[PDB]
Design a protein around this ligand. Sequence first.
Ligand SMILES: [Mg+2]
Ligand SMILES: [Mg+2]
Length: 254
Amino acid sequence: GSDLTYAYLVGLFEGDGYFSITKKGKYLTYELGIELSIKDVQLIYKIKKILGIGIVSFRKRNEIEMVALRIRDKNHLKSFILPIFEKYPMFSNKQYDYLRFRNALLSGIISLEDLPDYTRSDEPLNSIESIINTSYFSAWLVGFIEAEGCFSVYKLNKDDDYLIASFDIAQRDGDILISAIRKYLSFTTKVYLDKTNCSKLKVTSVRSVENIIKFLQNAPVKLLGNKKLQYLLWLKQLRKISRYSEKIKIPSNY
DNA sequence: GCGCGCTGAGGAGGTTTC
DNA sequence: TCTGTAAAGCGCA
DNA sequence: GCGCTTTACAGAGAAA
DNA sequence: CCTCCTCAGCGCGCT
Ligand SMILES: [Mg+2]
Ligand SMILES: [Mg+2]
Protein backbone atom coordinates (compact mmCIF):
# COMPACT_ATOMS: atom_id res chain seq x y z
CA GLY A 1 0.00 0.00 0.00
CA SER A 2 0.82 3.76 0.27
CA ASP A 3 1.68 5.65 3.37
CA LEU A 4 -1.99 6.58 2.79
CA THR A 5 -3.74 3.51 1.46
CA TYR A 6 -3.44 2.15 5.02
CA ALA A 7 -5.39 5.15 6.31
CA TYR A 8 -7.87 3.89 3.74
CA LEU A 9 -7.89 0.52 5.45
CA VAL A 10 -8.70 1.66 8.95
CA GLY A 11 -11.39 3.63 7.22
CA LEU A 12 -12.92 0.46 5.73
CA PHE A 13 -12.42 -1.50 8.93
CA GLU A 14 -13.94 1.18 11.07
CA GLY A 15 -17.07 1.03 8.99
CA ASP A 16 -17.28 -2.68 8.23
CA GLY A 17 -14.69 -4.43 10.35
CA TYR A 18 -14.58 -5.23 14.05
CA PHE A 19 -12.14 -5.85 16.92
CA SER A 20 -13.10 -8.70 19.16
CA ILE A 21 -11.63 -10.67 22.10
CA THR A 22 -13.78 -13.80 22.39
CA LYS A 23 -14.18 -16.78 24.68
CA LYS A 24 -12.22 -19.83 23.40
CA GLY A 25 -12.99 -22.37 26.11
CA LYS A 26 -10.45 -21.75 28.90
CA TYR A 27 -8.76 -18.98 26.86
CA LEU A 28 -9.32 -16.09 24.45
CA THR A 29 -9.30 -15.41 20.71
CA TYR A 30 -7.99 -12.01 19.71
CA GLU A 31 -9.00 -10.92 16.23
CA LEU A 32 -9.77 -8.23 13.69
CA GLY A 33 -12.19 -9.11 10.94
CA ILE A 34 -14.37 -7.84 8.11
CA GLU A 35 -17.13 -9.98 6.77
CA LEU A 36 -18.54 -8.77 3.48
CA SER A 37 -20.95 -9.97 0.86
CA ILE A 38 -19.45 -12.49 -1.52
CA LYS A 39 -19.70 -9.54 -3.92
CA ASP A 40 -16.38 -8.34 -2.53
CA VAL A 41 -14.35 -11.53 -2.58
CA GLN A 42 -12.09 -9.68 -4.89
CA LEU A 43 -11.74 -6.75 -2.43
CA ILE A 44 -11.06 -9.10 0.48
CA TYR A 45 -8.04 -10.44 -1.34
CA LYS A 46 -6.80 -6.93 -2.10
CA ILE A 47 -6.85 -6.29 1.67
CA LYS A 48 -4.94 -9.49 2.39
CA LYS A 49 -2.40 -8.39 -0.20
CA ILE A 50 -2.07 -4.91 1.33
CA LEU A 51 -1.84 -6.14 4.91
CA GLY A 52 0.05 -9.28 3.94
CA ILE A 53 -1.68 -11.39 6.56
CA GLY A 54 -5.13 -12.74 7.35
CA ILE A 55 -7.20 -15.90 6.94
CA VAL A 56 -10.05 -15.85 4.35
CA SER A 57 -13.22 -17.83 4.86
CA PHE A 58 -16.49 -18.32 3.04
CA ARG A 59 -20.02 -19.13 4.22
CA LYS A 60 -23.62 -19.20 3.12
CA ARG A 61 -26.00 -18.19 6.18
CA ASN A 62 -27.87 -19.81 3.62
CA GLU A 63 -28.98 -17.71 0.78
CA ILE A 64 -26.43 -14.90 1.44
CA GLU A 65 -22.83 -15.87 0.59
CA MET A 66 -20.10 -14.03 2.53
CA VAL A 67 -16.35 -13.62 2.67
CA ALA A 68 -14.28 -12.76 5.64
CA LEU A 69 -10.68 -11.79 6.30
CA ARG A 70 -9.66 -12.63 9.83
CA ILE A 71 -6.47 -11.95 11.69
CA ARG A 72 -6.09 -13.79 15.02
CA ASP A 73 -2.39 -14.46 15.22
CA LYS A 74 -1.28 -12.26 18.11
CA ASN A 75 2.29 -11.84 16.87
CA HIS A 76 0.95 -10.67 13.54
CA LEU A 77 -1.56 -8.47 15.33
CA LYS A 78 1.06 -6.87 17.53
CA SER A 79 3.55 -6.73 14.66
CA PHE A 80 1.31 -5.42 11.88
CA ILE A 81 -2.14 -4.34 13.03
CA LEU A 82 -1.67 -2.24 16.14
CA PRO A 83 0.97 -0.15 14.36
CA ILE A 84 -1.47 0.66 11.56
CA PHE A 85 -4.19 1.84 13.90
CA GLU A 86 -1.71 3.73 16.07
CA LYS A 87 -0.47 5.65 13.05
CA TYR A 88 -3.92 6.24 11.50
CA PRO A 89 -6.39 5.92 14.40
CA MET A 90 -10.13 5.57 13.82
CA PHE A 91 -12.32 8.62 14.64
CA SER A 92 -15.70 7.36 15.81
CA ASN A 93 -16.58 6.18 19.27
CA LYS A 94 -15.12 2.94 17.95
CA GLN A 95 -11.52 3.63 18.96
CA TYR A 96 -12.71 2.42 22.39
CA ASP A 97 -12.79 -1.06 20.89
CA TYR A 98 -9.24 -0.70 19.56
CA LEU A 99 -7.89 0.83 22.77
CA ARG A 100 -9.54 -1.88 24.88
CA PHE A 101 -8.41 -4.56 22.42
CA ARG A 102 -4.85 -3.14 22.38
CA ASN A 103 -4.50 -2.93 26.11
CA ALA A 104 -5.75 -6.45 26.83
CA LEU A 105 -3.41 -7.65 24.16
CA LEU A 106 -0.24 -5.84 25.17
CA SER A 107 -1.01 -6.60 28.81
CA GLY A 108 -0.76 -10.30 28.00
CA ILE A 109 -4.29 -11.01 29.13
CA ILE A 110 -4.93 -14.59 28.07
CA SER A 111 -7.78 -15.64 30.33
CA LEU A 112 -11.39 -14.57 30.42
CA GLU A 113 -11.09 -13.90 34.14
CA ASP A 114 -8.41 -11.24 33.91
CA LEU A 115 -10.06 -9.53 30.95
CA PRO A 116 -11.64 -6.16 31.95
CA ASP A 117 -15.39 -5.68 31.79
CA TYR A 118 -15.90 -3.62 28.66
CA THR A 119 -18.71 -1.57 27.15
CA ARG A 120 -18.29 1.06 24.41
CA SER A 121 -19.02 4.58 25.47
CA ASP A 122 -21.28 6.43 22.98
CA GLU A 123 -19.47 9.47 24.19
CA PRO A 124 -17.41 10.76 21.21
CA LEU A 125 -13.66 11.24 21.32
CA ASN A 126 -13.29 14.10 18.86
CA SER A 127 -15.48 16.75 17.41
CA ILE A 128 -15.72 18.12 13.86
CA GLU A 129 -12.61 20.33 13.77
CA SER A 130 -10.32 17.56 15.02
CA ILE A 131 -11.58 14.95 12.55
CA ILE A 132 -11.65 17.38 9.64
CA ASN A 133 -8.13 18.66 10.38
CA THR A 134 -6.21 15.43 10.65
CA SER A 135 -4.03 14.78 7.61
CA TYR A 136 -5.15 11.28 6.68
CA PHE A 137 -8.85 12.14 6.92
CA SER A 138 -9.43 12.50 3.16
CA ALA A 139 -8.12 8.97 2.74
CA TRP A 140 -9.88 7.50 5.73
CA LEU A 141 -13.21 8.85 4.38
CA VAL A 142 -12.65 7.05 1.16
CA GLY A 143 -12.53 3.71 2.93
CA PHE A 144 -15.33 4.69 5.29
CA ILE A 145 -17.35 5.39 2.20
CA GLU A 146 -16.23 2.12 0.55
CA ALA A 147 -17.67 0.59 3.71
CA GLU A 148 -20.81 2.55 4.49
CA GLY A 149 -21.58 5.06 1.79
CA CYS A 150 -24.45 4.46 -0.67
CA PHE A 151 -24.87 5.55 -4.31
CA SER A 152 -28.38 5.12 -5.64
CA VAL A 153 -31.00 6.25 -8.14
CA TYR A 154 -34.80 5.98 -7.92
CA LYS A 155 -37.84 7.55 -9.59
CA LEU A 156 -39.48 10.21 -7.35
CA ASN A 157 -43.02 8.88 -7.92
CA LYS A 158 -44.14 5.44 -9.10
CA ASP A 159 -45.96 6.75 -12.18
CA ASP A 160 -43.73 9.43 -13.76
CA ASP A 161 -40.01 8.80 -14.65
CA TYR A 162 -38.33 11.62 -12.67
CA LEU A 163 -35.07 10.27 -11.22
CA ILE A 164 -33.38 11.50 -8.03
CA ALA A 165 -29.77 10.20 -7.67
CA SER A 166 -28.59 10.30 -4.04
CA PHE A 167 -25.47 9.54 -2.04
CA ASP A 168 -26.00 8.71 1.61
CA ILE A 169 -24.20 7.45 4.69
CA ALA A 170 -25.18 6.81 8.29
CA GLN A 171 -23.58 5.70 11.52
CA ARG A 172 -24.87 4.79 14.96
CA ASP A 173 -23.78 7.08 17.84
CA GLY A 174 -21.92 9.20 15.32
CA ASP A 175 -23.50 12.62 15.18
CA ILE A 176 -20.10 14.28 15.42
CA LEU A 177 -18.60 11.91 12.87
CA ILE A 178 -21.45 12.13 10.42
CA SER A 179 -21.67 15.92 10.85
CA ALA A 180 -17.96 16.35 10.32
CA ILE A 181 -18.13 14.50 6.98
CA ARG A 182 -21.20 16.57 6.18
CA LYS A 183 -19.16 19.69 6.77
CA TYR A 184 -16.11 18.42 4.86
CA LEU A 185 -18.08 17.74 1.63
CA SER A 186 -20.06 20.92 2.19
CA PHE A 187 -23.47 19.27 2.26
CA THR A 188 -26.27 21.21 3.94
CA THR A 189 -28.94 18.54 4.21
CA LYS A 190 -30.10 18.08 7.82
CA VAL A 191 -28.47 15.06 9.49
CA TYR A 192 -31.30 12.87 10.74
CA LEU A 193 -31.22 10.85 14.02
CA ASP A 194 -33.44 7.71 13.66
CA LYS A 195 -35.29 5.32 16.02
CA THR A 196 -31.82 4.23 17.19
CA ASN A 197 -28.98 6.67 17.82
CA CYS A 198 -28.18 6.37 14.09
CA SER A 199 -27.18 9.57 12.31
CA LYS A 200 -28.17 9.45 8.63
CA LEU A 201 -26.71 11.87 6.07
CA LYS A 202 -28.19 12.01 2.55
CA VAL A 203 -28.01 14.32 -0.42
CA THR A 204 -29.83 14.86 -3.70
CA SER A 205 -28.89 18.31 -4.97
CA VAL A 206 -27.04 18.90 -8.20
CA ARG A 207 -24.40 20.68 -6.16
CA SER A 208 -24.06 18.01 -3.45
CA VAL A 209 -23.68 15.24 -6.00
CA GLU A 210 -21.15 17.37 -7.83
CA ASN A 211 -19.24 17.46 -4.60
CA ILE A 212 -18.75 13.78 -3.73
CA ILE A 213 -17.60 13.19 -7.30
CA LYS A 214 -14.97 15.86 -6.90
CA PHE A 215 -13.89 14.72 -3.46
CA LEU A 216 -13.46 11.22 -4.90
CA GLN A 217 -11.74 12.33 -8.09
CA ASN A 218 -9.33 14.34 -5.96
CA ALA A 219 -8.97 12.03 -2.97
CA PRO A 220 -5.51 10.62 -2.23
CA VAL A 221 -6.63 7.11 -2.72
CA LYS A 222 -9.05 4.99 -4.34
CA LEU A 223 -12.12 2.85 -3.84
CA LEU A 224 -11.30 -0.50 -5.08
CA GLY A 225 -14.24 -2.70 -4.17
CA ASN A 226 -17.84 -3.28 -4.90
CA LYS A 227 -18.70 0.25 -3.81
CA LYS A 228 -16.38 1.37 -6.59
CA LEU A 229 -18.55 -0.50 -9.08
CA GLN A 230 -21.71 0.83 -7.42
CA TYR A 231 -20.36 4.28 -8.03
CA LEU A 232 -19.42 3.69 -11.64
CA LEU A 233 -22.91 2.45 -12.47
CA TRP A 234 -24.26 5.51 -10.61
CA LEU A 235 -22.02 7.81 -12.64
CA LYS A 236 -23.50 6.20 -15.73
CA GLN A 237 -27.12 6.91 -14.88
CA LEU A 238 -26.01 10.37 -13.96
CA ARG A 239 -25.53 11.02 -17.67
CA LYS A 240 -29.07 10.11 -18.68
CA ILE A 241 -30.32 12.53 -16.02
CA SER A 242 -30.04 15.98 -17.60
CA ARG A 243 -30.16 18.33 -14.60
CA TYR A 244 -26.97 16.57 -13.51
CA SER A 245 -25.31 16.05 -16.93
CA GLU A 246 -25.52 19.55 -18.25
CA LYS A 247 -24.08 20.31 -14.84
CA ILE A 248 -20.86 18.28 -14.01
CA LYS A 249 -17.91 16.33 -15.39
CA ILE A 250 -17.26 12.70 -14.49
CA PRO A 251 -15.86 9.45 -15.87
CA SER A 252 -12.55 7.68 -16.15
CA ASN A 253 -12.59 5.97 -12.58
CA TYR A 254 -13.27 5.49 -8.74
C1' DG B 1 6.17 -40.74 24.55
C1' DC B 2 3.45 -38.34 27.42
C1' DG B 3 0.64 -34.91 29.77
C1' DC B 4 0.33 -29.99 30.30
C1' DG B 5 -0.28 -25.05 29.06
C1' DC B 6 -1.61 -22.41 25.44
C1' DT B 7 -2.53 -21.18 20.43
C1' DG B 8 -4.83 -20.34 16.00
C1' DA B 9 -7.19 -22.16 11.59
C1' DG B 10 -11.46 -23.94 10.71
C1' DG B 11 -16.25 -23.95 11.43
C1' DA B 12 -20.63 -21.90 12.82
C1' DG B 13 -24.71 -19.72 16.11
C1' DG B 14 -26.83 -15.12 17.18
C1' DT B 15 -27.91 -9.90 16.75
C1' DT B 16 -28.42 -5.50 14.29
C1' DT B 17 -26.38 -1.38 11.70
C1' DC B 18 -26.45 0.19 7.72
C1' DT C 1 -27.34 0.33 2.85
C1' DC C 2 -30.92 1.28 -0.46
C1' DT C 3 -35.17 3.19 -1.95
C1' DG C 4 -38.80 5.90 -1.00
C1' DT C 5 -42.95 8.93 0.45
C1' DA C 6 -45.19 12.96 1.63
C1' DA C 7 -44.25 17.50 1.55
C1' DA C 8 -42.14 21.41 0.71
C1' DG C 9 -38.99 25.46 -2.03
C1' DC C 10 -38.48 28.33 -6.39
C1' DG C 11 -39.06 30.60 -10.14
C1' DC C 12 -42.11 32.21 -13.85
C1' DA C 13 -45.57 32.66 -16.99
C1' DG D 1 -50.25 27.24 -9.43
C1' DC D 2 -48.08 24.64 -12.26
C1' DG D 3 -43.23 22.24 -13.77
C1' DC D 4 -38.89 21.16 -11.87
C1' DT D 5 -36.03 20.41 -7.74
C1' DT D 6 -34.59 19.65 -3.16
C1' DT D 7 -35.76 17.80 1.66
C1' DA D 8 -37.29 16.08 6.11
C1' DC D 9 -38.38 11.66 7.68
C1' DA D 10 -37.86 6.64 7.88
C1' DG D 11 -38.95 1.44 6.91
C1' DA D 12 -36.88 -3.36 5.36
C1' DG D 13 -33.63 -6.41 5.37
C1' DA D 14 -29.24 -7.85 3.38
C1' DA D 15 -24.85 -7.04 4.68
C1' DA D 16 -22.78 -6.39 8.28
C1' DC E 1 -20.82 -6.80 13.11
C1' DC E 2 -20.14 -10.12 17.56
C1' DT E 3 -19.50 -14.49 19.86
C1' DC E 4 -18.22 -19.30 21.09
C1' DC E 5 -16.12 -24.18 20.49
C1' DT E 6 -13.45 -28.12 18.52
C1' DC E 7 -9.03 -30.03 17.65
C1' DA E 8 -4.30 -30.76 15.44
C1' DG E 9 -0.30 -29.24 17.48
C1' DC E 10 3.79 -27.08 19.37
C1' DG E 11 7.39 -26.50 23.11
C1' DC E 12 8.34 -28.20 27.79
C1' DG E 13 9.58 -30.73 31.44
C1' DC E 14 9.26 -35.14 33.32
C1' DT E 15 8.89 -40.17 34.15
MG1 LIG F 1 -20.03 0.16 10.44
MG1 LIG G 1 -20.09 -1.96 2.41
